[PDB]
Amino acid sequence: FVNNPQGNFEQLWKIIDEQYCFLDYKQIDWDEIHTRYQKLITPNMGSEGLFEVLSEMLYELQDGHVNLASAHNVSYYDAWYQDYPRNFRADLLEDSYLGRASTDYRTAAGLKYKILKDNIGYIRYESFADPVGNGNLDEVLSYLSVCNGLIIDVRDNGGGNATNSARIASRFTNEKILTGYISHKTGTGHNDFSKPYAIYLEPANGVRWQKKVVVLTNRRSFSATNDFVNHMRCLPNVTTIGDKTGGGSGMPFTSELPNGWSVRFSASPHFDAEMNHIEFGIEPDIKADMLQEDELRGKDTLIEMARKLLSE
C-alpha cells in the first residue's frame, strides 16, 4: 500500500481483518466499519487528522490492548485500565517496606528483595523489560528460604521482553504442569483458528521455592506479567491478591503502516487451564484494594493482607 492517507487506512483495516483474533468473539462488523471510515479518509489530511480517524476506527474494537503509535501520540481504548483504582504506591513501598538499597534490601538484576520483619520474604519485580537470570533467581530463593512465606509483587508491571514469564514461574513447581492454552490463526477468516495448544510449565533447573507464595496483582499488571500470573495461579502453593490484571499477553503481533506508524494487538488467543480467555484480565483469588486509611498509617493493604495470610 502506498504512503498516503487511503493506503494507511486500507493497510490498517486489512491487518485487523486478517490477524486480529477477537472480531467474531466480540461480534464486530469490520466490513461495516470499512465502508463507514472510508468516507472519512481523504487526500491531504494532516497527520493529526489521520491519526484521530484511524484511532477511532480501532476504538470500535473496544480493546485496551490494540495500540496505535505515531511520532506524536499513542492511542488505545482507555476505560479499560482507568475505570479501576491504581492500587500501587511506589513512594509508600519504598518508605515503609523496601527502604534504602544500600542496606535495607538487596538487588539481583531486575529483582528487589528482602526479609521483612515478620520473616516473610518479599520480591518486587517492577518490569519484565528488566533482565532476570537463573543465577539471580538461585540467589534470591536461597536467601529467602529461611522465611515462612513469600510475596511476589508484580503490580504496575506492564510487561516487557527481557525475561520470559516461565523463567520465574518455573521456580514454583516441582512437576511438569499444564497452565494454559494458546490458539493461533490459521487463515484470514475471523474464526480461522487452530485447536488450542497446551502450555506446560516445567520445573526450573535451579533453586525452587517449597513454601507458600502470594503474588500481588493490579490492573496495570499486563502483557508478559499477565502470562506470569496465569502460570502462577495454577500452582499448589500460590495465592493471588489484589485487583484483576490488565490482560494482554506477552505475544502481541506488531505491524508497521506505510507511514511508519505501528499497530499492536492480539493475534493468538491465550486461555487459562480451564479454557477461559485471559487477555481481558485475570481475577485475583482474594480481591483487595489499597485503603486510603491504611496508606495514611504507612501501610499497603495488599502487602499486609499477604503477610497475614502467609503467617498462619
PDB file of C-alpha atoms in Angstrom, residues 15-293:
ATOM      1  CA  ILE A  15      -4.143  -6.116   9.263  1.00  0.00           C
ATOM      2  CA  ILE A  16      -7.003  -6.162  11.773  1.00  0.00           C
ATOM      3  CA  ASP A  17      -9.254  -8.008   9.335  1.00  0.00           C
ATOM      4  CA  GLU A  18      -6.785 -10.830   8.706  1.00  0.00           C
ATOM      5  CA  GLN A  19      -4.904 -11.118  12.016  1.00  0.00           C
ATOM      6  CA  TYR A  20      -6.938  -9.679  14.905  1.00  0.00           C
ATOM      7  CA  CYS A  21      -8.355 -12.567  16.867  1.00  0.00           C
ATOM      8  CA  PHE A  22     -11.446 -11.062  18.548  1.00  0.00           C
ATOM      9  CA  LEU A  23     -13.597  -9.954  15.589  1.00  0.00           C
ATOM     10  CA  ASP A  24     -16.014 -12.883  15.878  1.00  0.00           C
ATOM     11  CA  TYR A  25     -15.711 -13.182  19.677  1.00  0.00           C
ATOM     12  CA  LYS A  26     -16.812  -9.560  20.062  1.00  0.00           C
ATOM     13  CA  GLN A  27     -19.396  -9.646  17.232  1.00  0.00           C
ATOM     14  CA  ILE A  28     -17.815  -6.882  15.120  1.00  0.00           C
ATOM     15  CA  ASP A  29     -18.896  -5.931  11.595  1.00  0.00           C
ATOM     16  CA  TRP A  30     -15.462  -4.933  10.398  1.00  0.00           C
ATOM     17  CA  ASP A  31     -16.918  -4.670   6.888  1.00  0.00           C
ATOM     18  CA  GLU A  32     -19.457  -2.053   8.020  1.00  0.00           C
ATOM     19  CA  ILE A  33     -16.596  -0.226   9.711  1.00  0.00           C
ATOM     20  CA  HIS A  34     -14.609  -0.247   6.470  1.00  0.00           C
ATOM     21  CA  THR A  35     -17.257   1.422   4.374  1.00  0.00           C
ATOM     22  CA  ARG A  36     -18.080   3.973   7.065  1.00  0.00           C
ATOM     23  CA  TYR A  37     -14.489   5.046   7.877  1.00  0.00           C
ATOM     24  CA  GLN A  38     -13.548   5.004   4.178  1.00  0.00           C
ATOM     25  CA  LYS A  39     -15.778   8.050   3.818  1.00  0.00           C
ATOM     26  CA  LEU A  40     -13.655   9.982   6.328  1.00  0.00           C
ATOM     27  CA  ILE A  41     -10.220   9.227   4.821  1.00  0.00           C
ATOM     28  CA  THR A  42      -9.131  11.814   2.254  1.00  0.00           C
ATOM     29  CA  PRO A  43      -6.040  13.042   0.430  1.00  0.00           C
ATOM     30  CA  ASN A  44      -4.111  15.756   2.260  1.00  0.00           C
ATOM     31  CA  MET A  45      -5.465  15.229   5.758  1.00  0.00           C
ATOM     32  CA  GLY A  46      -2.765  16.104   8.213  1.00  0.00           C
ATOM     33  CA  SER A  47      -1.031  13.503  10.344  1.00  0.00           C
ATOM     34  CA  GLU A  48      -3.157  14.800  13.207  1.00  0.00           C
ATOM     35  CA  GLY A  49      -6.442  14.202  11.356  1.00  0.00           C
ATOM     36  CA  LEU A  50      -5.455  10.774  10.018  1.00  0.00           C
ATOM     37  CA  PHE A  51      -4.242   9.627  13.405  1.00  0.00           C
ATOM     38  CA  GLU A  52      -7.524  10.671  15.027  1.00  0.00           C
ATOM     39  CA  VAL A  53      -9.638   8.883  12.404  1.00  0.00           C
ATOM     40  CA  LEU A  54      -7.635   5.634  12.449  1.00  0.00           C
ATOM     41  CA  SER A  55      -7.663   5.785  16.242  1.00  0.00           C
ATOM     42  CA  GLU A  56     -11.468   5.985  16.328  1.00  0.00           C
ATOM     43  CA  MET A  57     -11.698   3.106  13.882  1.00  0.00           C
ATOM     44  CA  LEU A  58      -9.656   0.958  16.340  1.00  0.00           C
ATOM     45  CA  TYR A  59     -11.730   2.220  19.298  1.00  0.00           C
ATOM     46  CA  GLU A  60     -14.617   0.376  17.652  1.00  0.00           C
ATOM     47  CA  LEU A  61     -12.898  -2.840  18.774  1.00  0.00           C
ATOM     48  CA  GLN A  62     -13.114  -1.579  22.382  1.00  0.00           C
ATOM     49  CA  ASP A  63      -9.802  -3.216  23.286  1.00  0.00           C
ATOM     50  CA  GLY A  64      -7.220  -1.576  25.522  1.00  0.00           C
ATOM     51  CA  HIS A  65      -4.597  -3.889  24.022  1.00  0.00           C
ATOM     52  CA  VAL A  66      -4.982  -2.560  20.500  1.00  0.00           C
ATOM     53  CA  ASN A  67      -2.324   0.144  20.258  1.00  0.00           C
ATOM     54  CA  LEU A  68      -1.573   2.670  17.517  1.00  0.00           C
ATOM     55  CA  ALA A  69       1.677   4.645  17.771  1.00  0.00           C
ATOM     56  CA  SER A  70       2.942   7.585  15.718  1.00  0.00           C
ATOM     57  CA  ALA A  71       5.687  10.130  16.251  1.00  0.00           C
ATOM     58  CA  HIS A  72       3.277  12.430  18.117  1.00  0.00           C
ATOM     59  CA  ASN A  73       0.937  10.138  20.044  1.00  0.00           C
ATOM     60  CA  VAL A  74      -0.163   6.655  21.048  1.00  0.00           C
ATOM     61  CA  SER A  75      -3.788   5.578  21.021  1.00  0.00           C
ATOM     62  CA  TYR A  76      -5.651   2.877  22.937  1.00  0.00           C
ATOM     63  CA  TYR A  77      -9.139   2.201  24.334  1.00  0.00           C
ATOM     64  CA  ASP A  78      -8.822   3.792  27.785  1.00  0.00           C
ATOM     65  CA  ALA A  79     -11.780   2.922  30.057  1.00  0.00           C
ATOM     66  CA  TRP A  80     -10.055  -0.475  30.026  1.00  0.00           C
ATOM     67  CA  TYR A  81      -7.438   0.426  32.652  1.00  0.00           C
ATOM     68  CA  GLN A  82      -8.599   3.672  34.258  1.00  0.00           C
ATOM     69  CA  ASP A  83     -12.032   2.549  35.445  1.00  0.00           C
ATOM     70  CA  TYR A  84     -10.093   0.557  38.200  1.00  0.00           C
ATOM     71  CA  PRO A  85      -8.130   2.133  41.090  1.00  0.00           C
ATOM     72  CA  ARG A  86      -4.364   2.392  40.983  1.00  0.00           C
ATOM     73  CA  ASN A  87      -3.720   0.034  43.920  1.00  0.00           C
ATOM     74  CA  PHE A  88       0.025   0.687  43.964  1.00  0.00           C
ATOM     75  CA  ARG A  89       2.115   3.488  45.522  1.00  0.00           C
ATOM     76  CA  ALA A  90       5.831   3.407  44.733  1.00  0.00           C
ATOM     77  CA  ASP A  91       6.796   6.052  47.294  1.00  0.00           C
ATOM     78  CA  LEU A  92       4.881   4.172  50.010  1.00  0.00           C
ATOM     79  CA  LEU A  93       6.531   0.899  49.051  1.00  0.00           C
ATOM     80  CA  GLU A  94       9.980   2.399  49.345  1.00  0.00           C
ATOM     81  CA  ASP A  95       9.352   4.374  52.556  1.00  0.00           C
ATOM     82  CA  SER A  96       7.557   1.639  54.520  1.00  0.00           C
ATOM     83  CA  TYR A  97       8.728  -1.706  53.099  1.00  0.00           C
ATOM     84  CA  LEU A  98      11.872  -1.588  50.940  1.00  0.00           C
ATOM     85  CA  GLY A  99      13.840   1.318  52.470  1.00  0.00           C
ATOM     86  CA  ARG A 100      17.378   2.154  51.245  1.00  0.00           C
ATOM     87  CA  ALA A 101      19.042  -0.046  48.596  1.00  0.00           C
ATOM     88  CA  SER A 102      22.430   0.318  50.269  1.00  0.00           C
ATOM     89  CA  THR A 103      21.369  -1.508  53.434  1.00  0.00           C
ATOM     90  CA  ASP A 104      17.640  -2.246  53.620  1.00  0.00           C
ATOM     91  CA  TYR A 105      17.100  -4.510  50.595  1.00  0.00           C
ATOM     92  CA  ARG A 106      19.060  -6.450  48.014  1.00  0.00           C
ATOM     93  CA  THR A 107      19.120  -6.154  44.215  1.00  0.00           C
ATOM     94  CA  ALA A 108      19.512  -9.211  41.974  1.00  0.00           C
ATOM     95  CA  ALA A 109      19.316  -7.732  38.458  1.00  0.00           C
ATOM     96  CA  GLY A 110      15.616  -6.960  37.940  1.00  0.00           C
ATOM     97  CA  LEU A 111      14.545  -8.206  41.402  1.00  0.00           C
ATOM     98  CA  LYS A 112      14.489  -6.152  44.588  1.00  0.00           C
ATOM     99  CA  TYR A 113      14.114  -8.416  47.597  1.00  0.00           C
ATOM    100  CA  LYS A 114      14.399  -8.639  51.350  1.00  0.00           C
ATOM    101  CA  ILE A 115      13.249 -10.345  54.525  1.00  0.00           C
ATOM    102  CA  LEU A 116      10.517  -8.377  56.225  1.00  0.00           C
ATOM    103  CA  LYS A 117      10.329  -8.024  59.994  1.00  0.00           C
ATOM    104  CA  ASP A 118       7.920 -10.977  60.453  1.00  0.00           C
ATOM    105  CA  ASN A 119      10.123 -13.391  58.469  1.00  0.00           C
ATOM    106  CA  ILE A 120       8.037 -13.063  55.292  1.00  0.00           C
ATOM    107  CA  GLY A 121      10.085 -12.849  52.114  1.00  0.00           C
ATOM    108  CA  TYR A 122       9.297 -10.019  49.691  1.00  0.00           C
ATOM    109  CA  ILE A 123      10.270  -9.716  45.990  1.00  0.00           C
ATOM    110  CA  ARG A 124       9.425  -6.614  43.968  1.00  0.00           C
ATOM    111  CA  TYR A 125       9.622  -7.099  40.184  1.00  0.00           C
ATOM    112  CA  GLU A 126       8.811  -3.798  38.504  1.00  0.00           C
ATOM    113  CA  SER A 127       9.260  -4.676  34.832  1.00  0.00           C
ATOM    114  CA  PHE A 128       9.714  -7.675  32.561  1.00  0.00           C
ATOM    115  CA  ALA A 129      11.791  -5.276  30.481  1.00  0.00           C
ATOM    116  CA  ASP A 130      14.456  -5.734  33.223  1.00  0.00           C
ATOM    117  CA  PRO A 131      16.567  -8.908  32.884  1.00  0.00           C
ATOM    118  CA  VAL A 132      16.342 -11.679  35.476  1.00  0.00           C
ATOM    119  CA  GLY A 133      18.859 -14.531  35.103  1.00  0.00           C
ATOM    120  CA  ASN A 134      18.798 -18.040  36.527  1.00  0.00           C
ATOM    121  CA  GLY A 135      21.720 -17.149  38.816  1.00  0.00           C
ATOM    122  CA  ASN A 136      19.761 -14.179  40.185  1.00  0.00           C
ATOM    123  CA  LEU A 137      16.840 -16.488  40.991  1.00  0.00           C
ATOM    124  CA  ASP A 138      19.078 -19.094  42.687  1.00  0.00           C
ATOM    125  CA  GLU A 139      20.476 -16.342  44.937  1.00  0.00           C
ATOM    126  CA  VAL A 140      17.097 -14.793  45.760  1.00  0.00           C
ATOM    127  CA  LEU A 141      15.270 -18.019  46.607  1.00  0.00           C
ATOM    128  CA  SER A 142      18.243 -19.339  48.614  1.00  0.00           C
ATOM    129  CA  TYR A 143      18.494 -16.157  50.696  1.00  0.00           C
ATOM    130  CA  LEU A 144      14.729 -16.145  51.350  1.00  0.00           C
ATOM    131  CA  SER A 145      14.471 -19.881  52.113  1.00  0.00           C
ATOM    132  CA  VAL A 146      14.571 -19.057  55.850  1.00  0.00           C
ATOM    133  CA  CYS A 147      11.274 -17.135  55.534  1.00  0.00           C
ATOM    134  CA  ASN A 148       7.895 -18.658  56.370  1.00  0.00           C
ATOM    135  CA  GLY A 149       6.289 -17.476  53.110  1.00  0.00           C
ATOM    136  CA  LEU A 150       6.960 -15.340  50.053  1.00  0.00           C
ATOM    137  CA  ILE A 151       5.317 -12.316  48.415  1.00  0.00           C
ATOM    138  CA  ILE A 152       5.951 -11.556  44.723  1.00  0.00           C
ATOM    139  CA  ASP A 153       4.755  -8.059  43.802  1.00  0.00           C
ATOM    140  CA  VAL A 154       4.150  -7.536  40.082  1.00  0.00           C
ATOM    141  CA  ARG A 155       1.735  -4.610  40.438  1.00  0.00           C
ATOM    142  CA  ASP A 156       2.249  -1.874  37.832  1.00  0.00           C
ATOM    143  CA  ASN A 157       4.438  -4.286  35.838  1.00  0.00           C
ATOM    144  CA  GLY A 158       3.389  -3.531  32.253  1.00  0.00           C
ATOM    145  CA  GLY A 159       5.388  -6.392  30.787  1.00  0.00           C
ATOM    146  CA  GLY A 160       8.479  -6.379  28.607  1.00  0.00           C
ATOM    147  CA  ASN A 161      10.685  -8.764  26.679  1.00  0.00           C
ATOM    148  CA  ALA A 162      13.920  -9.059  28.697  1.00  0.00           C
ATOM    149  CA  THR A 163      12.720 -12.050  30.791  1.00  0.00           C
ATOM    150  CA  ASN A 164      10.254 -14.826  29.949  1.00  0.00           C
ATOM    151  CA  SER A 165       7.390 -15.277  32.399  1.00  0.00           C
ATOM    152  CA  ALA A 166       8.168 -19.010  32.613  1.00  0.00           C
ATOM    153  CA  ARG A 167      11.733 -18.377  33.803  1.00  0.00           C
ATOM    154  CA  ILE A 168      10.349 -17.009  37.066  1.00  0.00           C
ATOM    155  CA  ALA A 169       7.225 -19.118  37.378  1.00  0.00           C
ATOM    156  CA  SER A 170       9.086 -22.406  36.894  1.00  0.00           C
ATOM    157  CA  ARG A 171      10.759 -21.798  40.269  1.00  0.00           C
ATOM    158  CA  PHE A 172       7.433 -22.596  41.939  1.00  0.00           C
ATOM    159  CA  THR A 173       6.585 -26.022  40.509  1.00  0.00           C
ATOM    160  CA  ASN A 174       8.396 -29.304  41.098  1.00  0.00           C
ATOM    161  CA  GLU A 175       6.400 -31.130  38.388  1.00  0.00           C
ATOM    162  CA  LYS A 176       5.518 -30.505  34.754  1.00  0.00           C
ATOM    163  CA  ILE A 177       2.069 -28.900  34.895  1.00  0.00           C
ATOM    164  CA  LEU A 178      -0.405 -27.629  32.307  1.00  0.00           C
ATOM    165  CA  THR A 179      -1.007 -23.930  32.965  1.00  0.00           C
ATOM    166  CA  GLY A 180      -2.926 -22.703  29.916  1.00  0.00           C
ATOM    167  CA  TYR A 181      -3.685 -22.900  26.232  1.00  0.00           C
ATOM    168  CA  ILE A 182      -2.924 -20.871  23.089  1.00  0.00           C
ATOM    169  CA  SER A 183      -4.626 -20.902  19.689  1.00  0.00           C
ATOM    170  CA  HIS A 184      -3.129 -19.248  16.624  1.00  0.00           C
ATOM    171  CA  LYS A 185      -4.802 -18.120  13.463  1.00  0.00           C
ATOM    172  CA  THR A 186      -4.706 -20.485  10.516  1.00  0.00           C
ATOM    173  CA  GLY A 187      -6.198 -18.222   7.859  1.00  0.00           C
ATOM    174  CA  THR A 188      -7.623 -14.787   7.255  1.00  0.00           C
ATOM    175  CA  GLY A 189     -11.187 -15.645   8.294  1.00  0.00           C
ATOM    176  CA  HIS A 190     -12.289 -14.096  11.569  1.00  0.00           C
ATOM    177  CA  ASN A 191     -12.658 -17.572  13.114  1.00  0.00           C
ATOM    178  CA  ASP A 192      -9.764 -19.368  11.337  1.00  0.00           C
ATOM    179  CA  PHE A 193      -8.060 -20.801  14.437  1.00  0.00           C
ATOM    180  CA  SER A 194      -6.109 -23.897  15.397  1.00  0.00           C
ATOM    181  CA  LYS A 195      -7.154 -26.220  18.131  1.00  0.00           C
ATOM    182  CA  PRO A 196      -5.735 -24.834  21.396  1.00  0.00           C
ATOM    183  CA  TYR A 197      -2.197 -25.966  22.195  1.00  0.00           C
ATOM    184  CA  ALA A 198      -1.353 -26.781  25.781  1.00  0.00           C
ATOM    185  CA  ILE A 199       1.155 -24.598  27.609  1.00  0.00           C
ATOM    186  CA  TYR A 200       3.258 -26.559  30.118  1.00  0.00           C
ATOM    187  CA  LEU A 201       5.454 -25.182  32.903  1.00  0.00           C
ATOM    188  CA  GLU A 202       8.401 -27.354  33.700  1.00  0.00           C
ATOM    189  CA  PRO A 203      10.359 -27.237  36.977  1.00  0.00           C
ATOM    190  CA  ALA A 204      13.346 -24.931  36.847  1.00  0.00           C
ATOM    191  CA  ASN A 205      16.900 -26.271  36.727  1.00  0.00           C
ATOM    192  CA  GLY A 206      17.914 -24.427  39.866  1.00  0.00           C
ATOM    193  CA  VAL A 207      16.754 -23.462  43.328  1.00  0.00           C
ATOM    194  CA  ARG A 208      12.986 -23.810  43.738  1.00  0.00           C
ATOM    195  CA  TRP A 209      10.587 -22.449  46.356  1.00  0.00           C
ATOM    196  CA  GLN A 210       8.880 -25.006  48.605  1.00  0.00           C
ATOM    197  CA  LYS A 211       6.652 -22.819  50.817  1.00  0.00           C
ATOM    198  CA  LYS A 212       3.522 -20.721  50.283  1.00  0.00           C
ATOM    199  CA  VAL A 213       3.515 -17.781  47.843  1.00  0.00           C
ATOM    200  CA  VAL A 214       1.340 -14.696  47.390  1.00  0.00           C
ATOM    201  CA  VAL A 215       1.519 -12.873  44.043  1.00  0.00           C
ATOM    202  CA  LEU A 216       0.235  -9.279  44.170  1.00  0.00           C
ATOM    203  CA  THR A 217      -1.579  -8.016  41.067  1.00  0.00           C
ATOM    204  CA  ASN A 218      -3.327  -4.908  39.786  1.00  0.00           C
ATOM    205  CA  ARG A 219      -4.958  -3.566  36.657  1.00  0.00           C
ATOM    206  CA  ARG A 220      -1.592  -2.216  35.487  1.00  0.00           C
ATOM    207  CA  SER A 221      -0.080  -5.720  35.576  1.00  0.00           C
ATOM    208  CA  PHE A 222      -0.230  -6.827  31.977  1.00  0.00           C
ATOM    209  CA  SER A 223       1.251  -8.410  28.818  1.00  0.00           C
ATOM    210  CA  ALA A 224       4.088 -10.743  29.921  1.00  0.00           C
ATOM    211  CA  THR A 225       3.017 -10.103  33.510  1.00  0.00           C
ATOM    212  CA  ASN A 226      -0.427 -11.493  32.659  1.00  0.00           C
ATOM    213  CA  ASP A 227       1.224 -14.673  31.341  1.00  0.00           C
ATOM    214  CA  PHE A 228       3.241 -14.874  34.598  1.00  0.00           C
ATOM    215  CA  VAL A 229       0.115 -14.514  36.759  1.00  0.00           C
ATOM    216  CA  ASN A 230      -1.581 -17.154  34.636  1.00  0.00           C
ATOM    217  CA  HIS A 231       1.325 -19.578  35.206  1.00  0.00           C
ATOM    218  CA  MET A 232       1.498 -18.885  38.916  1.00  0.00           C
ATOM    219  CA  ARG A 233      -2.125 -19.173  39.868  1.00  0.00           C
ATOM    220  CA  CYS A 234      -2.322 -22.830  38.833  1.00  0.00           C
ATOM    221  CA  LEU A 235       0.363 -23.881  41.230  1.00  0.00           C
ATOM    222  CA  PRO A 236      -0.380 -25.526  44.585  1.00  0.00           C
ATOM    223  CA  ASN A 237       1.383 -23.096  46.953  1.00  0.00           C
ATOM    224  CA  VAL A 238       0.252 -19.825  45.231  1.00  0.00           C
ATOM    225  CA  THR A 239      -2.486 -17.331  46.152  1.00  0.00           C
ATOM    226  CA  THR A 240      -3.072 -14.156  44.076  1.00  0.00           C
ATOM    227  CA  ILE A 241      -4.194 -10.994  45.942  1.00  0.00           C
ATOM    228  CA  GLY A 242      -5.188  -7.556  44.664  1.00  0.00           C
ATOM    229  CA  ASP A 243      -7.080  -6.470  41.567  1.00  0.00           C
ATOM    230  CA  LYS A 244      -7.916  -8.039  38.233  1.00  0.00           C
ATOM    231  CA  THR A 245      -4.881  -7.888  35.968  1.00  0.00           C
ATOM    232  CA  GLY A 246      -4.818  -5.613  32.899  1.00  0.00           C
ATOM    233  CA  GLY A 247      -4.875  -8.516  30.453  1.00  0.00           C
ATOM    234  CA  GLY A 248      -2.981  -8.776  27.217  1.00  0.00           C
ATOM    235  CA  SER A 249      -0.223 -11.313  26.655  1.00  0.00           C
ATOM    236  CA  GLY A 250       3.492 -11.460  26.135  1.00  0.00           C
ATOM    237  CA  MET A 251       2.981 -12.363  22.459  1.00  0.00           C
ATOM    238  CA  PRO A 252       1.216  -9.453  20.710  1.00  0.00           C
ATOM    239  CA  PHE A 253       1.522  -9.055  16.964  1.00  0.00           C
ATOM    240  CA  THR A 254       3.071  -5.768  15.741  1.00  0.00           C
ATOM    241  CA  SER A 255       2.870  -4.336  12.239  1.00  0.00           C
ATOM    242  CA  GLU A 256       4.024  -1.129  10.545  1.00  0.00           C
ATOM    243  CA  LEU A 257       1.899   1.081   8.365  1.00  0.00           C
ATOM    244  CA  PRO A 258       3.262   2.615   5.174  1.00  0.00           C
ATOM    245  CA  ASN A 259       3.733   5.909   7.043  1.00  0.00           C
ATOM    246  CA  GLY A 260       5.875   4.310   9.760  1.00  0.00           C
ATOM    247  CA  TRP A 261       3.246   4.157  12.447  1.00  0.00           C
ATOM    248  CA  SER A 262       2.887   0.856  14.228  1.00  0.00           C
ATOM    249  CA  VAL A 263      -0.111  -1.133  15.462  1.00  0.00           C
ATOM    250  CA  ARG A 264      -0.033  -3.740  18.215  1.00  0.00           C
ATOM    251  CA  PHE A 265      -2.843  -6.152  19.038  1.00  0.00           C
ATOM    252  CA  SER A 266      -3.688  -9.749  19.956  1.00  0.00           C
ATOM    253  CA  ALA A 267      -3.293 -12.363  17.213  1.00  0.00           C
ATOM    254  CA  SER A 268      -3.128 -15.599  19.299  1.00  0.00           C
ATOM    255  CA  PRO A 269      -5.850 -16.186  21.933  1.00  0.00           C
ATOM    256  CA  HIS A 270      -4.470 -17.175  25.344  1.00  0.00           C
ATOM    257  CA  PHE A 271      -6.505 -19.240  27.804  1.00  0.00           C
ATOM    258  CA  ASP A 272      -6.127 -20.421  31.354  1.00  0.00           C
ATOM    259  CA  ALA A 273      -6.062 -24.130  32.091  1.00  0.00           C
ATOM    260  CA  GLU A 274      -9.880 -24.363  32.061  1.00  0.00           C
ATOM    261  CA  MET A 275     -10.222 -22.624  28.639  1.00  0.00           C
ATOM    262  CA  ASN A 276     -11.148 -19.129  29.897  1.00  0.00           C
ATOM    263  CA  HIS A 277      -9.825 -16.187  27.873  1.00  0.00           C
ATOM    264  CA  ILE A 278      -7.233 -14.361  29.968  1.00  0.00           C
ATOM    265  CA  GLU A 279      -6.469 -11.351  27.714  1.00  0.00           C
ATOM    266  CA  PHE A 280      -9.241  -9.253  29.264  1.00  0.00           C
ATOM    267  CA  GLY A 281      -7.811  -9.691  32.761  1.00  0.00           C
ATOM    268  CA  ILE A 282      -7.353 -12.431  35.363  1.00  0.00           C
ATOM    269  CA  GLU A 283      -9.391 -12.143  38.553  1.00  0.00           C
ATOM    270  CA  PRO A 284      -7.352 -12.494  41.755  1.00  0.00           C
ATOM    271  CA  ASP A 285      -8.028 -15.266  44.273  1.00  0.00           C
ATOM    272  CA  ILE A 286      -8.537 -12.619  47.004  1.00  0.00           C
ATOM    273  CA  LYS A 287      -9.911  -9.247  45.881  1.00  0.00           C
ATOM    274  CA  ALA A 288      -8.415  -6.318  47.784  1.00  0.00           C
ATOM    275  CA  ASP A 289      -7.844  -2.613  47.180  1.00  0.00           C
ATOM    276  CA  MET A 290      -5.352  -0.361  48.902  1.00  0.00           C
ATOM    277  CA  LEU A 291      -7.295   1.614  51.527  1.00  0.00           C
ATOM    278  CA  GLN A 292      -6.522   5.293  51.985  1.00  0.00           C
ATOM    279  CA  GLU A 293      -6.961   4.886  55.735  1.00  0.00           C
TER     280      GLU A 293
END
